[PDB]
Amino acid sequence: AVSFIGSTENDVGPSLGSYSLPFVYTRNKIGYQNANVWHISKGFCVGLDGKVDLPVVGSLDGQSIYGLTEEVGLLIWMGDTKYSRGTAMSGNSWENVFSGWCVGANTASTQGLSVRVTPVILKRNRYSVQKTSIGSIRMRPYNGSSAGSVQTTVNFSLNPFTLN
Ligand SMILES: CC(=O)N[C@@H]1[C@@H](O)[C@H](O)[C@@H](CO)O[C@H]1O
Numbered sequence: 001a002v003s004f005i006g007s008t009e010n011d012v013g014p015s016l017g018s019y020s021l022p023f024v025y026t027r028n029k030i031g032y033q034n035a036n037v038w039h040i041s042k043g044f045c046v047g048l049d050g051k052v053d054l055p056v057v058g059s060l061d062g063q064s065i066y067g068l069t070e071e072v073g074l075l076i077w078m079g080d081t082k083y084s085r086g087t088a089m090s091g092n093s094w095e096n097v098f099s100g101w102c103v104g105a106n107t108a109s110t111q112g113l114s115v116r117v118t119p120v121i122l123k124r125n126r127y128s129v130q131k132t133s134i135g136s137i138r139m140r141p142y143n144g145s146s147a148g149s150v151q152t153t154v155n156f157s158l159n160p161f162t163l164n
Pocket of ligand 1: 034035036080081101109110111112113
C-alpha cells in the first residue's frame, strides 16, 4: 500500500539565513529534508523524479546554474532523504533523482526526499533573495506498483536568505 503523509508545500533552508565570477558559496544548510513523505508497505516499489522550474542561466561541471536575480543563482540537488544521495539538477524537465527501492512484501516503511541548494554570485555590487518557487519532486512507482489514490507531487520554495 501507499499513503501520502508529508506536506505539499516545503521551504528550503532556514528562513532569512545568512551565508558568507561566477563564484560558488553552504553544504547542506540551505535545504529541505523529510524522511517521511509517503508511507509504503507490502512490496511497494518507489523512486523519485525531480523538476526545477527556475530559468537556467549557465552551468558548472555538468549541472545547471538556476537564476534567482541578476546577482544570485543556484546549484540545485534533489533526491532521496539523505543529502549525500542528492542528484545534481539540469534543465527544466522531470529527471530521475532516486532510482528507487522496494519495501518488504510483509513490512512497512516510509519514502522520503531532500532538496539542497548552494548560492552562486553572478554579479557583484550583500545580496538578498526573497521566497522563490524552486520546483517539485514526484514519487515514481515501478514494478507494477500504483500511485493509486495518493498525492504524487510536492513542491519546494526557497526561503529568503542573505549572502555576505
Ligand atoms: C524513517 C526512514 O528513515 N525512512 C527511509 C526513507 O526516508 C527513505 O526514503 C527510504 C529509501 O532510502 O528508506 C527508509 O528506511
